[PDB]
Amino acid sequence: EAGITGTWYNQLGSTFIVTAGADGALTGTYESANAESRYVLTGRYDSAPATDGSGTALGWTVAWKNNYRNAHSATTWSGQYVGGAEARINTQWLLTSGTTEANAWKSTLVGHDTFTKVKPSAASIDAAKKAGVNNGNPLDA
Amino acid sequence: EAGITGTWYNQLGSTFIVTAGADGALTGTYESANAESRYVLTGRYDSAPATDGSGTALGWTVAWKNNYRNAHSATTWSGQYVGGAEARINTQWLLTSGTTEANAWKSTLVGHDTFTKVKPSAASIDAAKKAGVNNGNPLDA
Amino acid sequence: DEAGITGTWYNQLGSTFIVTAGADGALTGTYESGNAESRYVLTGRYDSAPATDGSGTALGWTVAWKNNYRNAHSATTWSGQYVGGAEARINTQWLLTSGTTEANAWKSTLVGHDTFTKVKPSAASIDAAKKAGVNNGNPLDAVQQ
Amino acid sequence: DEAGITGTWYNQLGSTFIVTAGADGALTGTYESGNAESRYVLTGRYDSAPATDGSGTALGWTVAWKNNYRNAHSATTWSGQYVGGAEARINTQWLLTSGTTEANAWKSTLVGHDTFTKVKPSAASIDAAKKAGVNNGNPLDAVQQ
């Protein structure tokens, strides 16, 4: 809640800006390390998590359309928030593109992203970058 | 848009009630074949799809908390809408439970759901049911 | 399950795999789209002693999409379970990973699902499947049309 | 890649697999959590002639979680790619499917990711990994503690 609301950064400096509402809503924007690269997001989170050391389940969606570009696709992230001095949101994502029926087999990509509250540097932003980046962001996005 | 807004039914009679807004918002509820089993959903969809026979990309999230139960989990569906006389929404989903760090390996289930606009019968609602149902709905939900 | 799994399996698009289930848990065979150019080696594992409570039989297999004719520089894994009976079926989830550059790693893996039965589908069935959007885990480029 | 893949690989929690890459594309070996009771047969496939453009080497493998000691009635597949070099690495996505009843089929398959390198992690590294939430694709019940 207090912990989820705010700005989050992935492995590559992509930026997730989110407000967690009292009622379980997630609202915000997803962008790159640029208004051309900013997209609306919305989701849900468990607003009354267990108090046993478990993470807080959540998920959200970005449709990759804004006033500048349309990639005809949408990503959903499913994951959990873990608070603390090194707070993280660990996720798995699915990126589905609109396709014809014949191409439906290649409609959905899968991956994983970890978000933290401190912006990374180009060192760990490029090394880790050579480690295999995992944006669920289509290039056009 | 006109085509996505409305009530959708999965393989097992689970019910997805959604409004597609002009701006790309999805808002609605997810429920069983019961207010105890109704949960808020929110998502995004491509409000300006290609006109080449491709589907419309979309996704949405349910956090499995309502005023009756809390499963401490959230499902995201990623998929595409295909319109027509047998309109469908084909999806893949991820169900992540809040877990401790040690149990994070079993935090996320994966599956697939197809939604159509006509409510199925118990025949095809139980056969197809013996065919292996795929709700992304945790039991407590 | 050794006897129940061994044999030819079809998806609803007609893709075919031929597998031998070994007593030791091995799965060995081929996956094909009809012709040799579309046929690939498969190998995997299955639970050779599953629970005796009505549960399915966990299994998985891999196909690397290289044979003596073509190479799609990719590989698919299928993870799922066998259910025996007069309508025996293998329900799976698959992952198709392509070799890519580092920059393209994030878009290296497709995910999908597919179901196999022992009954060859008719063109009819094959036509409605295609209609319900194709679910195969083979890349089209593995297919010699 | 036959030479680069053959050998022992570790995840950041210390799980280990030992694989031989055959010239023909086969992957053969074992997966273990230290002791025999936690060791399982693996088999898979890899692209034995990958692209010559900087791309990785597509591969996959399966482990059914049955050995001579225990049986978890499940199987995992890993799909991913090998990247060679002084910091050689195998990046994967995995699917862990348990045999279940029909009613529980919807919750039969876990998904996750894991990365392997040729360097055994220290307890330190192992401790921060555990901290960053465990990513292994083996069920705990496959592990003899």
Side-chain angles (χ1 to χ4, degrees):
Chain A
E1 22 92 60
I4 293 163
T5 289
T7 295
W8 294 85
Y9 304 99
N10 76 357
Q11 33 253 129
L12 318 316
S14 292
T15 302
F16 162 53
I17 299 155
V18 72
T19 290
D23 55 359
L26 305 178
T27 49
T29 63
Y30 198 99
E31 65 190 281
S32 271
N34 199 335
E36 307 128 80
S37 64
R38 212 158 144 85
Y39 300 81
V40 166
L41 72 91
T42 193
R44 301 289 298 167
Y45 76 105
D46 176 6
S47 56
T51 51
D52 68 352
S54 301
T56 295
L58 80 178
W60 72 87
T61 302
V62 173
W64 296 107
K65 175 189 184 279
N66 61 10
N67 296 138
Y68 305 99
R69 302 110 219 305
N70 194 354
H72 302 303
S73 65
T75 297
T76 55
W77 292 258
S78 179
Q80 63 180 309
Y81 155 84
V82 189
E86 269 69 57
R88 251 159 188 166
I89 300 175
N90 298 308
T91 66
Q92 305 195 250
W93 55 257
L94 301 166
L95 161 51
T96 302
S97 288
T99 66
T100 59
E101 300 309 60
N103 291 339
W105 68 272
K106 43 171 334 191
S107 64
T108 308
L109 293 162
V110 65
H112 52 89
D113 302 1
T114 300
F115 299 86
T116 74
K117 283 233 53 132
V118 60
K119 129 192 283 171
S121 228
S124 36
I125 238 219
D126 336 358
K129 213 192 234 245
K130 353 126 75 223
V133 34
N134 316 107
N135 48 302
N137 154 113
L139 26 132
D140 329 299
Chain B
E1 22 92 60
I4 293 163
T5 289
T7 295
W8 294 85
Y9 304 99
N10 76 357
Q11 33 253 129
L12 318 316
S14 292
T15 302
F16 162 53
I17 299 155
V18 72
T19 290
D23 55 359
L26 305 178
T27 49
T29 63
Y30 198 99
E31 65 190 281
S32 271
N34 199 335
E36 307 128 80
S37 64
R38 212 158 144 85
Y39 300 81
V40 166
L41 72 91
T42 193
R44 301 289 298 167
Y45 76 105
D46 176 6
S47 56
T51 51
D52 68 352
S54 301
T56 295
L58 80 178
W60 72 87
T61 302
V62 173
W64 296 107
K65 175 189 184 279
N66 61 10
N67 296 138
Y68 305 99
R69 302 110 219 305
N70 194 354
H72 302 303
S73 65
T75 297
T76 55
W77 292 258
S78 179
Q80 63 180 309
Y81 155 84
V82 189
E86 269 69 57
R88 251 159 188 166
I89 300 175
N90 298 308
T91 66
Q92 305 195 250
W93 55 257
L94 301 166
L95 161 51
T96 302
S97 288
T99 66
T100 59
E101 300 309 60
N103 291 339
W105 68 272
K106 43 171 334 191
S107 64
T108 308
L109 293 162
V110 65
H112 52 89
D113 302 1
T114 300
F115 299 86
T116 74
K117 283 233 53 132
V118 60
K119 129 192 283 171
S121 228
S124 36
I125 238 219
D126 336 358
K129 213 192 234 245
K130 353 126 75 223
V133 34
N134 316 107
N135 48 302
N137 154 113
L139 26 132
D140 329 299
Chain C
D1 302 346
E2 178 173 9
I5 289 164
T6 286
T8 302
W9 295 85
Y10 300 89
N11 72 2
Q12 324 83 260
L13 314 161
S15 292
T16 315
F17 70 90
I18 304 190
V19 69
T20 293
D24 57 354
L27 294 178
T28 64
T30 58
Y31 197 99
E32 47 185 329
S33 200
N35 37 218
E37 291 97 326
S38 302
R39 200 191 300 142
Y40 295 87
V41 172
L42 88 70
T43 193
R45 304 288 299 168
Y46 80 104
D47 177 3
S48 65
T52 60
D53 58 0
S55 309
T57 300
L59 70 201
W61 71 87
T62 306
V63 170
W65 300 107
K66 183 197 177 293
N67 60 19
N68 299 154
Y69 299 92
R70 48 203 308 131
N71 189 354
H73 302 310
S74 60
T76 300
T77 56
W78 298 255
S79 177
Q81 47 185 322
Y82 160 85
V83 165
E87 224 312 301
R89 299 165 93 65
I90 299 176
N91 291 320
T92 70
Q93 289 289 157
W94 51 261
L95 296 166
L96 164 54
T97 303
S98 300
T100 65
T101 52
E102 230 63 20
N104 290 336
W106 61 272
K107 52 173 265 222
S108 70
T109 306
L110 295 166
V111 58
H113 51 93
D114 203 2
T115 298
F116 306 84
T117 66
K118 287 174 185 174
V119 182
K120 187 171 174 95
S122 63
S125 78
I126 277 171
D127 275 334
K130 310 211 177 209
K131 238 98 185 298
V134 306
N135 302 165
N136 20 44
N138 65 89
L140 185 62
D141 206 16
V143 175
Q144 169 61 69
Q145 292 297 3
Chain D
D1 302 346
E2 178 173 9
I5 289 164
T6 286
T8 302
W9 295 85
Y10 300 89
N11 72 2
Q12 324 83 260
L13 314 161
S15 292
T16 315
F17 70 90
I18 304 190
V19 69
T20 293
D24 57 354
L27 294 178
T28 64
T30 58
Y31 197 99
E32 47 185 329
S33 200
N35 37 218
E37 291 97 326
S38 302
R39 200 191 300 142
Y40 295 87
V41 172
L42 88 70
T43 193
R45 304 288 299 168
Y46 80 104
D47 177 3
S48 65
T52 60
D53 58 0
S55 309
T57 300
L59 70 201
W61 71 87
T62 306
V63 170
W65 300 107
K66 183 197 177 293
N67 60 19
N68 299 154
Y69 299 92
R70 48 203 308 131
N71 189 354
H73 302 310
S74 60
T76 300
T77 56
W78 298 255
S79 177
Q81 47 185 322
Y82 160 85
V83 165
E87 224 312 301
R89 299 165 93 65
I90 299 176
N91 291 320
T92 70
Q93 289 289 157
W94 51 261
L95 296 166
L96 164 54
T97 303
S98 300
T100 65
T101 52
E102 230 63 20
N104 290 336
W106 61 272
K107 52 173 265 222
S108 70
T109 306
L110 295 166
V111 58
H113 51 93
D114 203 2
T115 298
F116 306 84
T117 66
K118 287 174 185 174
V119 182
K120 187 171 174 95
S122 63
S125 78
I126 277 171
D127 275 334
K130 310 211 177 209
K131 238 98 185 298
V134 306
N135 302 165
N136 20 44
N138 65 89
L140 185 62
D141 206 16
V143 175
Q144 169 61 69
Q145 292 297 3

